[PDB]
Symmetry: C2
Subunit: 164 residues, 2 copies
């Protein structure tokens, strides 16, 4: 078979929805983060998630060398955090972590303590596919804001949930 | 670092949200599909998605031996399809596909033509991690439905999107 056009693929993907996360890191190689909507759980033993990020980015470089990271599922009121970590407004990488919402838990990675879900993680394995590194990360601590709804991305806009 | 208890990881995941998909297949090993809350896009060249499914599923071995599959992101009105493919009502596998909204496109996998998004795919790589197979699949065709609001799963309930 021939694969669809990359343009067609991206067009279609805009019709699917995703949660919005920020992946962050800190350690000997420094502080960095980016928004990532290609994230999912893998298995519960050992508890493992994966995230797919383009290897060309500033943050990918620092995440992979620090070897630890957080995955932070953002809550409905946090679209501005997603924008900043997606490069909207071009906030310099190290100025992105100003507020008190970011704290360490176990690994030294910054964890967003008011995110719907924050997992603090160690990198266990990496599979490269096309432009992206698929990073498998084992969860060594968790945190949750008080109940709240998710930030969702769909058709190139932010949204949150409602019952059917 | 020690990993979190598996019970803690599962509890945390219920507070994240995911799109609801059905992964389906057909071929020499027969028809099968199942609901899947762990899917994401990987890279656009070649256009690749991944999905993680428990190796103990009846469907998982058939999907991997057939070598082809579809990923169908369900729309807000399709909770009954999700229910059926999560095994509610114990509907026999072949009968799940009797409805004419299920069609082939390119590979022979059943594609849900009215799903918000349906990708028809060939398996390219399988990585087994803990209890699950992480299946990398390249997209060879898609189906384009009209303006489809998502079916989302969050805190053990179905949901759809609203604006912020």
């Amino acid at each position: 078979f021939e694969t669809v056009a990359s343009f067609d693929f991206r067009d279609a993907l805009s019709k699917a929805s995703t949660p919005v996360t920020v992946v962050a890191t800190n350690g000997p190689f420094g502080l960095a983060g980016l928004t990532c909507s290609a994230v999912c759980s893998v298995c519960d033993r050992p508890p493992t998630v994966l995230l797919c990020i383009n290897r060309k980015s500033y943050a990918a470089g620092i995440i992979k060398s620090n070897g630890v990271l957080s995955v932070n599922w953002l809550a409905a009121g946090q679209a501005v955090i997603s924008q900043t970590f997606a490069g909207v407004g071009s906030v310099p990488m190290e100025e992105r972590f100003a507020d008190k919402g970011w704290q360490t838990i176990a690994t030294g990675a910054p964890y967003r303590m008011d995110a719907a879900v924050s997992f603090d993680c160690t990198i266990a394995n990496i599979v490269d596919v096309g432009s992206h590194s698929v990073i498998f990360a084992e969860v060594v601590a968790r945190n949750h804001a008080e109940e709240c709804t998710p930030l969702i991305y769909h058709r190139r806009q932010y949204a949150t949930t409602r019952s059917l």
